[PDB]
């Protein structure tokens, strides 16, 4: 687990001591989010994806119908619960709804035309010289000389435009208006229906597209209402305004997605890494989950092995400190969905061992405010203990997940076994790095003491069965003093029985 | 130039302060190496590549003849010298010879056979099948394959995309099952991870290629599949007296090379992290560990390191890179690579110029994002104390460069060494290396931050005036390139007497 | 308050620049105060006032006095201590320390008048005994019968003020030149820097004194002139089974002890930097080096270290210390001494109470001035990885203490160990160590930040209730002492089971 | 040697654990030694031995003595100094410091008579001049006419270095006080009124006469007593006028107000003295170390000289060896980063003035080796502002080089001192040989740590280049003769590009010839 490197006095010496022959621990801390689609929506494929390490099933509402998504969610649940007969080896799987959001698109039976460089193409609110799109106000917000991007930014341009970068035009392609004054509501009537559908389907989180300000986050939250109040809102930062207004967005949100696809069109591609590292750093500092997304293993759509760049990108997103990494096309429509999941799992474990925890822990603690929240004090202390004894795990009894989130913030090397009886908490926990959620099914014991002890033993059995630790190893256990929530204040250092 | 981020007390706060609206300086410090091939070998394309930011022309001797490469070298020189009429705007371009080394290749089927998962394939060295490869029988050039592989061994073909498992071993054949299928073409690369592969690091062919390199006056050799220090010594010995100044860059592309990296780094002038072969020879998820390890060790040693292969791979076919590719180039610079390299992108890609420009843009951004506070401290703490007055002058100049936020460090250098000593300490400011030696001007591109300039003015009579002339030349270059303006402060490194190896004078001077 | 503005600084320099005399320190005083008891301080009334002023340990110097004299002194210390036992909340345990005579060389009799030694003059040194009471300017007797055999050499007399160089030596005789002259009186101490002494580290006299110590139920032994680990083992062996819990503090007061410090530190319960003899045995200008070295190594080991001798020397005769003395006490605390010690100041001085109060005041100020940011980091980086659950619990507690700026760390401890483990990590907040063991309550004063409290309540049947009772006791103490108020947060350390060595539970709790 | 093993530690804790008493320090001693001259030390022969033992600055305490007495003392200092002037390689500049009386309160005459004040006894205090020479155990006169206005019932009055303490019981023309701490009371002892608001001028008519005398006597620096605000420093500077404009003003911080207004005082001053005597009476004694460490840290940050003063080796007035506390105090003042350390009674009136000088020299060299330069250089760097001053950039770069090659010295050609002061600010381990032709610059340079001033007497050469080389060679000869470095060793050399001041911009790393 790169322990030789972990004991270096400088980051440079740490890098010099990284050893390919030093195997990582069994635990994988970084959550894996997989977009489900044609390639991956069958129950059998989903079982293999869960086996390969999928933690969250992402549903992309830019496409498909409520029917198609309902069936997909049913299949995800069927695949998940197929492992429910053994609670020790069960793995919670979360469901994420990704909103369409303010998408501009062009005008299943699809043909494509060839747009040529130098040619003039007119835009109107399906072929060379006339192109229709759904944004009725385009003519107001753009000027001649502004760029218009079409089909993941591959094509670049009444509206009279010249084709700067041509290609196949297709149908119903997404458009980017680089920081034009686009007035499309952050929550459209379509989004409202999709969010309500999400609340009915009992989704764990919403990935809200094209969030530009705090008000947008409040709109999403308001639409979810009382019934959806526990659904996590992850704001996708995918334009210049969202990056400029990141602080107010981060305050209003439950977490963040660095949505690098749109972002790399909306801002110069060479600057995306700056925005990524900035958002991850700020989320780490805030203790709120951050997802690195889009084109992480893109070539695996068509190839059984990633490029060297892709391998580097996944590793660096984990070293930057992403809580989750995400597959899009790779798992939704790729020829190698299982290989993609396995590849993310392998790279994440390696990168996790290669984290300079000495510096990370210090900096995290120095930038955290002093507080008289007893749970926060307990969390940081537990992480310290975890390091001091090189503990096999941190076991956390949590009902809402908050206690486990507080531990996760301080980035322990050891996995955080979060024991809960709340299924939603067990699913949502995957948003946080190092949180290994376990769903206790055992009936409530008679003495609260005994109910606590039993939940701990559950965790001990899971850690043993998963090869996180052995009998005689030391683990950290976090409990409360009083039944109920927000009373986590007890840390114990105990041998595994 | 991310100055707000550069003043953070913690790396975390540094990251939180990275600002997309903070534009980088004009200077680009990381060298760009471009593989030359069919897409890029024309004089016109080469002119545009130099304009776009190419610093080193890499020639891949895995392919082509001496004739083909001689013409390529001539074209590179023609394109380079087309800008020589203005020494202020001239850019030296280095030539790199990349050796074939112990390559294993398949036979001939352009034709492709479709391999299906589960299907049987037989491997043979019998030349009867050299040009009769198909979905049932595959010939390869490694005559001793049957000796070094066992039942259960993997054989990887075509950049590791096709994978075969040995099921039965014969006297002169293998029966294999296709684990990962796909299209199999002609003359594809074969990797035998964990096999006992018995092939010389320097073949008789490599010896001829190296001799040709010495005749052609190449600046550096990228030596393939270096596994131990002895391999580097073989290359060095083959170059002889005439080639003694050619830089040997060892390509680390297998398990053994990574394990013996210290002895290799000692024996070599520099390193290339050759991630293509490396990502097949070791698990792909470990490549980043090997990369970061080698870069860190090279930086500590003050020897050049190149990050190579598939940095902007998708740009072979697309005018824009993936998000992963953008991140990879940035992270290689942040890791502290001296140079970044394009392979297929420039050799055979549809967008060679865009690829060069993209590396130039990402490198400048990543260079601004370096946490110099920590980097400079750590570098100094891990460098040994020396009696060498030039080492002390260098470190002092880098410190001063920081202290006054200098526009550049101007270094008068004959052999490169003084500028290399400055480069080791990673100043933010560009190092304008003034030389009259053309080879030094070319070779200087291997080091980060070294902007080499070739003074052609005759040696003036008063040594002090010969010095002033060369400093003024660098001032004119920096002004014309928009590195600094009149009134700005720069650092100047000179020697106390004529010759090489007497650099000991640092001056802080206004730009005139 | 408590210089917390300074504690937030990113650099030690900025920390120093932020030290504020107008920022008043917390009520708690963490550094133990050891006072030598003698003619000025042995009365019950004076002892009561010394306890009030802040005395934690009563040191008995066995270089002087009889068993009778010391027994009465111990009785008086106990009488004074127990006079406050009627209120367990406001009671303060007081430890008794026996300081051994050890291998002392002393001069003969001149009445108690003096001769004048002149620089350059010859002096004879003799062990004859015929000159035992006839010492003069020509002949000096001493009790070390083996002197003429171990010297070849400088000889120091009377606190190192008189210095003699051996000019010529015979058996039974020695001739010296007076290098530094002065007034020589009767029965002065002799030091032989280097000049390897054969005297036993534990003499027959020391054996009797140690046995007396065991009979009197002393808490700790300060063992004089420890030179090696074997010496520490001899002391430990002499104490036997009955004395097994008595702490052995090795006094490091010669060059050999400093050179063999690691083996001594391993064998001992703690260390005293005995600067008197040490500043004669090694050049005075090097004592600070030895002090800082020993304190640093003790802190790193988690074993108590005492800074001793001449800390407030001028207060023997003056009601206020010098500026140097004020600085010395502050720097000993900043170096990280667990205890500071008064010798002549309290034993024989005119102002024993003022001396105790002065140490109390300076210690509190210096404790607020501690750069906890760097100290805690360095402490953790130099501490070994262990599977001791109590060690992991302790460090975690100290982190928590910082994170919430807790008013105290409450520790239930039977042997002291758990509270010692907390103390090692140097929390700012006071460590309220609740015990029912009186010896543990006394011995705890050897460790910085440990405020020992002696619970007298009977053991409850329900272990949980017995724990709660003891925690409540500590809450009452902290409230009454003004360490914290109702609603404040404190850290509580408990074990999971009755017994010793099971501390593993940390709670963050409001004060009720 | 020179605690190099300790200097390479990754942490300050490990650095402390690696301090080795058997590791000898380098020959060079970087911390300036200031000695108060008086009855014990004013002879030419004693002064020669003090210079030999390591005295850098002769401090004259104008709280005592006459102009005549001090003029003779200055003459003697000069005579002793110039006795070594025939060899410029082995000559050592010695500075003269005038320490002002400042707003003191002093008691009357009992001259050299004493009374015994007993604890619990009543003592009457009076400003009535009738008792000015009739002080006794019952009535004590003092010179502060307004005392009765500024003190209250319960106030403390401290007399004679705070050794005698009186509590005001009754206020009248008089105060009735109870003696809390008694002892022997002599004539003309200092009085402190902690927490009172004393209206006395920072520069009294006496101070004005003493300052004028100082300008006539060509003193190098003024130690200005009881500075409370920047305006006080401006008063001193104004009194010195055009003729005294180059004299360095060192503000003595010795009261609560001075500590609170330290930043404005530090801005206005050439440097600072932590005057711990009065300070430890004016503020609680247990806080003096906080004020000391604060002022030293801030002076280091500013690049202005700081002196640690008073009672550093006090017991050596009467004893040939210091206490253990005194040894520790000197070492810690150097570790804190004082530029100079100071002897008062030890050298002025003590029985062992030479031993005291030698002891400060020894302890300073040891403490200098024990500095954790790794952390100190980094922090100094991270706290210094970015500037476009080429001399500042050259200075820091030189210090870096000095460390990189473990240079034997940094040779600096300086006319005003400034370039050498800029080097000193970054605290190189290597000694700074400051070559000047200006004698006052050579004397004033001792205020800065590591600056070893050398006074070139050679005529100015016609070729500027040769005049530079001559001065560099002079420094090479000095460093060789002083055992700072040997032939073949590396040194750093700082020069300017043109004749004049404020042109230092050239650094060279050169072998010693
Ligand atoms: O003997 C001692 O304790 C001393 O020298 O301090
Ligand atoms: O006046 C002084 O020097 C003092 O009080 O230290
Ligand atoms: Mg999107
Ligand atoms: Mg004064």
User: C54 is written with which tokens?
Assistant: 């802040």
- Ligand whose nearest atom lies closest to the CA of C276: 1
d(CA D15, CA D8): 8
User: D483 is written with which tokens?
Assistant: 């055992």
d(CA A420, CA A320): 29
d(CA C386, CA A390): 8
User: C259 is written with which tokens?
Assistant: 């050179």
The CATH number of the domain where C469 resides is what? 3.40.1380.20
- Count of CB atoms situated within 10 Å of the CB of C390: 19
Residues 6+ apart with CB under 8 A from A199: A224, A225, A227, A228, A231
Query: Do A204 and A155 share a domain, yes or no?
Result: no
State how far residue C350 is from chain D, nearest Cα, in angstroms: 11
User: A161 is written with which tokens?
Assistant: 């435009």
> With 0-12 CB in 10 A as exposed, 13-18 as middle and 19+ as buried, what is C101?
middle
Taking each continuous run of H as one helix and of E as one strand, the counts in chain C are: 19, 22
Cβ atoms of B345 and B352 within 8 Å: the answer is: yes
Q: What is the distance in A from the centroid of ligand 2 to the CA of D99?
A: 10
Residues 6+ apart with CB under 8 A from A185: A102, A219
Which residue among A132, A157, A176 closes a domain?
A: A176
Element (H, E) at B112: none
At CA A388, angle to CA A386 and CA A389, rounded to 5?
70
Strands (DSSP E) along D100-145, which ranges? 105-106, 114-117, 122-126, 139-141
Query: Do B242 and B276 share a domain, yes or no?
Result: yes
**Adjacency order of strands within the sheet including C450-454:** A435-439, A416-420, A394-397, A474-480, A488-495, C503-510, C489-495, C409-412, C431-435, C450-454
User: A450 is written with which tokens?
Assistant: 């005994």
Backbone angles phi, psi at C507, to 5 degrees: -125, 145
d(CA A323, CA A235): 14
Query: Do C39 and C182 share a domain, yes or no?
Result: no
| Chain D interface includes B507 (CB < 8 A) | yes
Closest atom of ligand 1 to CA, residue C274? 6
Domain assignment of residue C464, yes or no: yes
d(CA C26, CA D161): 29
- The experimental technique used to determine this model is X-ray
State how far residue A86 is from chain B, nearest Cα, in angstroms: 31
Q: Is the CB of D278 under 6 A from ligand 2?
A: yes
> With 0-12 CB in 10 A as exposed, 13-18 as middle and 19+ as buried, what is D120?
exposed
* Mutation to test the A interface, candidates C403, C497, C502, C503, most A Cβ within 10 Å: C403
Residues 6+ apart with CB under 8 A from B67: none
Strands (DSSP E) along C80-136, which ranges? 95-99, 105-106, 115-117, 122-126
**Adjacency order of strands within the sheet including B409-412:** B450-454, B431-435, B409-412, B489-495, B503-510, D504-511, D490-496, D410-413, D432-436, D451-455
Cβ atoms of A61 and A98 within 8 Å: the answer is: yes
Query: Do B219 and B150 share a domain, yes or no?
Result: no
Closest atom of ligand 1 to CA, residue C279? 5
Locate breaks in chain A with C to N over 2.5 A; list the residue preceding each: 107, 125, 157
Query: Do B86 and B209 share a domain, yes or no?
Result: yes
The CATH number of the domain where B184 resides is what? 2.40.33.10
Residue ranges in A300-414 assigned as alpha helix (H)? 308-320, 329-332, 337-353, 357-367, 374-388, 402-409
| Chain B interface includes D394 (CB < 8 A) | yes
User: B334 is written with which tokens?
Assistant: 């942040």
Query: Do D183 and D212 share a domain, yes or no?
Result: no
**Collapsed DSSP state (helix, strand, coil) of residue D26:** coil
d(CA D322, CA D328): 10
Beta bridge partners of B510: B489
Q: Which DSSP symbol is given to A446?
A: S
Q: What is the distance in A from the centroid of ligand 1 to the CA of A263?
A: 72
d(CA A265, CA A149): 8
CB pairs under 8 A between A and B: 218
| Chain D interface includes C19 (CB < 8 A) | yes
Q: What Rg value do the Cα atoms of chain C yield, rounded? A: 24
Residues 6+ apart with CB under 8 A from C215: none
Domain assignment of residue C20, yes or no: no
User: A134 is written with which tokens?
Assistant: 């759904």
Domain assignment of residue B299, yes or no: yes
Residues 6+ apart with CB under 8 A from A176: A104, A148, A149, A150, A153, A262, A265, A266
Q: Which DSSP symbol is given to A173?
A: -
d(CA D148, CA C479): 43
Q: Using alpha carbons, select from C29, C85, C79 the residue that is nearest to residue C56.
A: C29
Domain assignment of residue B372, yes or no: no
User: D271 is written with which tokens?
Assistant: 């440097």
Total domains in chain B come to 3
Which residues of B are less than 8 Å from D388 in CB distance? 404-405, 489
User: C320 is written with which tokens?
Assistant: 């206020």
Query: Do B351 and B308 share a domain, yes or no?
Result: yes
Q: Is the CB of D277 under 6 A from ligand 2?
A: yes
Which residue among D134, D161, D192 closes a domain?
A: D192
Cα dihedral angle (D47, D50, D54, D58), rounded to 10 degrees?
A: -50
Percent composition of chain A: helix, strand, coil (DSSP 3-state, to 5): 40, 20, 40
Residues 6+ apart with CB under 8 A from B176: B120, B121, B122, B123, B155, B164, B165, B166, B167
At CA A404, angle to CA A400 and CA A409, rounded to 5?
125
- Ligand whose nearest atom lies closest to the CA of D162: 2
Sign of CA dihedral B3, B8, B11, B14: negative
Query: Do B206 and B167 share a domain, yes or no?
Result: no
N-to-C CA span, chain B: 24
Locate breaks in chain D with C to N over 2.5 A; list the residue preceding each: 110, 172
Nearest chain B alpha carbon to A306: B284
Q: What is the distance in A from the centroid of ligand 2 to the CA of D101?
A: 10
User: A199 is written with which tokens?
Assistant: 């609340």
- Count of CB atoms situated within 10 Å of the CB of C333: 27
Domain assignment of residue A8, yes or no: no
d(CA B59, CA B225): 16
The CATH number of the domain where C290 resides is what? 3.20.20.60
Is C243 annotated in a binding site? The answer is: no
Beta bridge partners of A150: A155, A175
Length of chain A: 497
Which residue among A332, A352, A372 closes a domain?
A: A352
DSSP assignment of A84-102 equals TT-TTT----EEEEEP--S
User: C350 is written with which tokens?
Assistant: 């005119």
Distance of CA B141 to the CA centre of its chain: 29
Cβ atoms of C94 and C51 within 8 Å: the answer is: yes
Q: Do B397 and D397 touch (CB under 8 A)?
A: yes
Length of chain D: 513
Half-sphere exposure of B134 (CA within 13 A, CB side): 4
Residues 6+ apart with CB under 8 A from C177: C120, C121, C122, C123, C164, C165, C167
| Nearest CB neighbour to D11, from listed C13, C311, C378 | C378
| Nearest CB neighbour to B395, from listed D400, D407, D510 | D400
Q: Could you identify the residue written with the tokens 């992850």?
A: A234
d(CA C115, CA B151): 100
> With 0-12 CB in 10 A as exposed, 13-18 as middle and 19+ as buried, what is A486?
middle
Domain assignment of residue A401, yes or no: yes
Residue ranges in C180-286 assigned as alpha helix (H)? 204-215, 229-239, 255-259, 261-267, 275-281
Q: Which DSSP symbol is given to B13?
A: H
User: Ligand 1: which residues within 6 Å by Cβ?
Assistant: C 251, 253, 274-278, 308-309
| Backbone angle region of D135, left / alpha / beta, with phi > 0 → left and psi within -120 to 50 → alpha | beta
- Count of CB atoms situated within 10 Å of the CB of B470: 23
Residues of D with catalytic annotation?
Answer: 59, 106, 252, 310
Is C357 annotated in a binding site? The answer is: no
Domain assignment of residue D436, yes or no: yes
Which residues of D are less than 8 Å from C319 in CB distance? 163, 165, 181
Beta bridge partners of C129: none
Domain assignment of residue A13, yes or no: no
Q: Could you identify the residue written with the tokens 């003459």?
A: D75
d(CA C381, CA C360): 31
Cβ atoms of C254 and C227 within 8 Å: the answer is: yes
Q: Could you identify the residue written with the tokens 């690195």?
A: A292
Q: Which DSSP symbol is given to A159?
A: E
Q: Using alpha carbons, select from C205, C273, C182, C226 the residue that is nearest to residue C67.
A: C205
Half-sphere exposure of A288 (CA within 13 A, CB side): 20
CA distances from residue B202 to B63, B113, B206, B217 in whole angstroms, order as listed:
16, 33, 6, 20
Residues 6+ apart with CB under 8 A from D64: D38
Beta bridge partners of A95: A57
> With 0-12 CB in 10 A as exposed, 13-18 as middle and 19+ as buried, what is C512?
exposed
Q: What is the distance in A from the centroid of ligand 2 to the CA of D278?
A: 5
Which residues of A are less than 8 Å from B159 in CB distance? 305
Strands B120-124 and B137-139 turn out to be: parallel
**Collapsed DSSP state (helix, strand, coil) of residue C335:** helix
Q: Whose CA is nearest to atom 3 of ligand 1?
A: C274
Q: Which DSSP symbol is given to A443?
A: P
Q: Which DSSP symbol is given to D348?
A: H
Query: Do B215 and B152 share a domain, yes or no?
Result: no
Distance of CA D162 to the CA centre of its chain: 22
Q: Which domain holds residue B330?
A: 28-101+202-366
**Adjacency order of strands within the sheet including C139-141:** C105-106, C189-191, C154-157, C162-170, C173-180, C122-126, C139-141
| Nearest CB neighbour to A270, from listed B182, B319, B361 | B361
Length of chain C: 512
CA distances from residue B189 to B96, B156, B280 in whole angstroms, order as listed:
22, 8, 11
Strands (DSSP E) along B104-208, which ranges? 113-115, 120-124, 137-139, 154-157, 162-169, 174-180, 182-184, 190-191
Which residues of D are less than 8 Å from C312 in CB distance? 325
N-to-C CA span, chain D: 24
Nearest chain A alpha carbon to B371: A11
d(CA D407, CA D509): 9
d(CA D141, CA D144): 9
398-457 of B, contacting D, C-beta below 8 A:
399-400, 403-406
Which residues of D are less than 8 Å from B392 in CB distance? 401-402, 404-405, 407, 490, 492, 509
CA distances from residue C5 to C15, C17, C32, D288 in whole angstroms, order as listed:
8, 10, 26, 18
User: B20 is written with which tokens?
Assistant: 């997309």
Query: Do B179 and B215 share a domain, yes or no?
Result: no
Distance of CA C341 to the CA centre of its chain: 6
CA distances from residue C399 to A376, B294, C217, C304 in whole angstroms, order as listed:
11, 36, 37, 21
Q: Is B58 a catalytic residue?
A: yes
Buried b (16+ CB within 10 A) or exposed e, A63-83: ebeeeebeebbebbbebbeee
Query: Do A251 and A114 share a domain, yes or no?
Result: no
Q: Using alpha carbons, select from D218, D284, D214 the residue that is nearest to residue D256.
A: D284
Query: Do C444 and C500 share a domain, yes or no?
Result: yes
Cβ atoms of B493 and B411 within 8 Å: the answer is: yes
The resolution of the experimental structure, rounded to one decimal in Å, is 2.6
d(CA A242, CA C322): 64
């Amino acid at each position: 687990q790169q322990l030789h490197a972990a004991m270096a006095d400088t980051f440079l010496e740490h890098m010099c001591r990284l050893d390919i022959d030093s195997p990582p621990i069994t635990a994988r801390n970084t959550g894996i989010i997989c977009t489900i689609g044609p390639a991956s929506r069958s129950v059998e494929t989903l079982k293999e994806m869960i086996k390969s390490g999928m933690n969250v099933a992402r549903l992309n509402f830019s496409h498909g119908t409520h029917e198609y998504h309902a069936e997909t969610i049913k299949n995800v649940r069927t695949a998940t619960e197929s492992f429910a007969s053994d609670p020790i080896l069960y793995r919670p799987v979360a469901v994420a709804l990704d909103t369409k959001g303010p998408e501009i698109r062009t005008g299943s039976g699809t043909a494509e035309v060839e747009l040529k460089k130098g040619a003039t193409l007119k835009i109107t609110p399906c072929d060379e010289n006339i192109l229709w799109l759904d944004y009725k106000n385009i003519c107001k917000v753009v000027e001649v000389g502004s760029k218009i991007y079409v089909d993941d930014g591959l094509i670049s341009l009444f509206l009279v435009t010249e084709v700067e970068n041509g290609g196949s035009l297709g149908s119903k392609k997404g458009v980017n208006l680089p920081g034009a004054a686009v007035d499309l509501p952050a929550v459209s009537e379509k989004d409202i229906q999709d969010l309500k559908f999400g609340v009915e389907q009992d989704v764990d989180m919403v990935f809200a597209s094209f969030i530009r300000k705090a008000s947008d986050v409040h709109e999403v939250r308001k639409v979810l209402g009382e019934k959806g109040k526990n659904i996590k809102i992850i704001s996708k930062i995918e334009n210049h305004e969202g990056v400029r207004r990141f602080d107010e967005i981060l305050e209003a949100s439950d977490g963040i997605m660095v949505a690098r696809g749109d972002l790399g069109i909306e801002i110069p591609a060479e600057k995306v890494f700056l925005a990524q590292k900035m958002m991850i750093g700020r989320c780490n500092r805030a203790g709120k989950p951050v997802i690195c997304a889009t084109q992480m293993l893109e070539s695996m759509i068509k190839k059984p092995r990633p490029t060297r760049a892709e391998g580097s990108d996944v590793a660096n997103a984990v070293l930057d400190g992403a809580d989750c990494i995400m597959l899009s096309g790779e798992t939704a429509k790729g020829d190698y969905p299982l290989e993609a999941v396995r590849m993310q799992h392998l790279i994440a474990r390696e990168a996790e061992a290669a984290i300079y925890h000495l510096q990370l822990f210090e900096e995290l603690r120095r930038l955290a405010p002093i507080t008289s929240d007893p749970t926060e004090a307990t969390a940081v202390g537990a992480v310290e203990a975890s390091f001091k004894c090189c503990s096999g795990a941190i076991i956390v009894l949590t009902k809402s997940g908050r206690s486990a989130h507080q531990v996760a913030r301080y980035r322990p090397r050891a996995p955080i076994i979060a024991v809960t009886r709340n299924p939603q908490t067990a699913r949502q926990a995957h948003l946080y790095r190092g949180i290994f959620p376990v769903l206790c099914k055992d009936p409530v014991q008679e003495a609260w003491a005994e109910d606590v002890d039993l939940r701990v033993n559950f965790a001990m059995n899971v850690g043993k069965a998963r090869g996180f630790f052995k009998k005689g190893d030391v683990v950290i256990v976090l409990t409360g003093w009083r039944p109920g929530s927000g009373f986590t204040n007890t840390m114990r250092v105990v041998p595994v029985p």
